[PDB]
Design a protein around this ligand. Structure first.
Ligand SMILES: [Mg+2]
Ligand SMILES: [Mg+2]
Ligand SMILES: [Mg+2]
Ligand SMILES: [Mg+2]
Ligand SMILES: [Mg+2]
Ligand SMILES: [Mg+2]
Ligand SMILES: [Mg+2]
Ligand SMILES: [Mg+2]
Ligand SMILES: [Mg+2]
Ligand SMILES: [Mg+2]
Ligand SMILES: [Mg+2]
Ligand SMILES: [Mg+2]
Length: 82
RNA sequence: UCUCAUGGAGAGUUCGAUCCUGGCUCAGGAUGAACGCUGGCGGCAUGCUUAACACAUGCAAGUCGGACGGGAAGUGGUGUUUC
């Protein structure tokens, strides 16, 4: 049995005045399963609840969490710029 | 006495009576019928003949994304699919 890396995919919900955030997990043969539900920014703390859900799960390595937090920070800053 | 024929009826009224010419009237069918009285059901039909007179409202001709450029719904994104 080899070692498969459960790579995580980042998703967003684009609303008029709001934007939500969610994460998925991907393993070979297991396909894709949702890791986290959609958190609506600015109304809720989206990046904070996403990284809190990635910390509560011990099987997420620091690198996979920090990459998704970097591109999700780039999308929250891109929404805030608009 | 083979064959064809499945078809044609009258009545009252002019005269004191009659025969005739002659009109009127009636008995029969048919309705895209109307009105009156009365009206239980089913089957198949029929239903502005008058003003080709006016029209409130709603519907009666669209379809093709496999001609085509686009944008708008979602989706995580041009992998899916819709309008
Ligand atoms: Mg006379
Ligand atoms: Mg007399
Ligand atoms: Mg005569
Ligand atoms: Mg008759
Ligand atoms: Mg009646
Ligand atoms: Mg007419
Ligand atoms: Mg009209
Ligand atoms: Mg219609
Ligand atoms: Mg189609
Ligand atoms: Mg179509
Ligand atoms: Mg064609
Ligand atoms: Mg396509």
């Amino acid at each position: 049995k080899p070692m498969d890396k459960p790579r995580l995919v980042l998703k967003f919900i684009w609303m008029e005045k709001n934007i939500g955030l969610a994460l998925d997990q991907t393993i070979p043969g297991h396909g894709t399963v949702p890791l986290s539900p959609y958190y609506f920014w600015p109304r809720k703390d989206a990046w904070e609840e996403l990284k809190v859900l990635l910390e509560n799960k011990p099987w997420i390595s620091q690198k996979q969490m920090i990459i998704l937090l970097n591109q999700a920070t780039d999308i929250i800053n891109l929404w805030q710029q608009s």
